[PDB]
Design a protein around this nucleic acid. Sequence first.
RNA 1: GGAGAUGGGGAGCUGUAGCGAAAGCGAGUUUUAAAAGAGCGUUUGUUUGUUAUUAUAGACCCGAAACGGGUUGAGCUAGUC
Length: 52
Amino acid sequence: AKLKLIKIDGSFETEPVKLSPGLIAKELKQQPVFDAVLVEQASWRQGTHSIL
RNA sequence: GGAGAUGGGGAGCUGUAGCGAAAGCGAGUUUUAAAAGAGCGUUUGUUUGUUAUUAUAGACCCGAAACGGGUUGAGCUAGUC
Ligand SMILES: [Mg+2]
Ligand SMILES: [Mg+2]
Ligand SMILES: [Mg+2]
Ligand SMILES: [Mg+2]
């Protein structure tokens, strides 16, 4: 793809960088993405609730 | 590594060949003198997430008369001095 550089002033570079096709995948998986987000949200739990 | 996602870590676990108590043999094996007959095999995996059931824990909640171990009581009362 056309991934292009950014300078400090906010103007764009005139030379875009080509991208190897291995990065972009023609097949997208959404269920593994959902499970990854859920396990990231989990393990953030302190779990210090206690009752007698 | 942030009380992280994760990376390293292949120790192991399931499946890949089964049969027999076993030595053993092996797409065959056990029984038997038998190769016949019969039994079992000659294929469909694994790791997670969710739900249902189940096993160990008190295991849906409330309820005994009880049992065992320790301490406190003879200012009431019973006896004795
Ligand atoms: Mg790990
Ligand atoms: Mg046969
Ligand atoms: Mg599968
Ligand atoms: Mg008295």
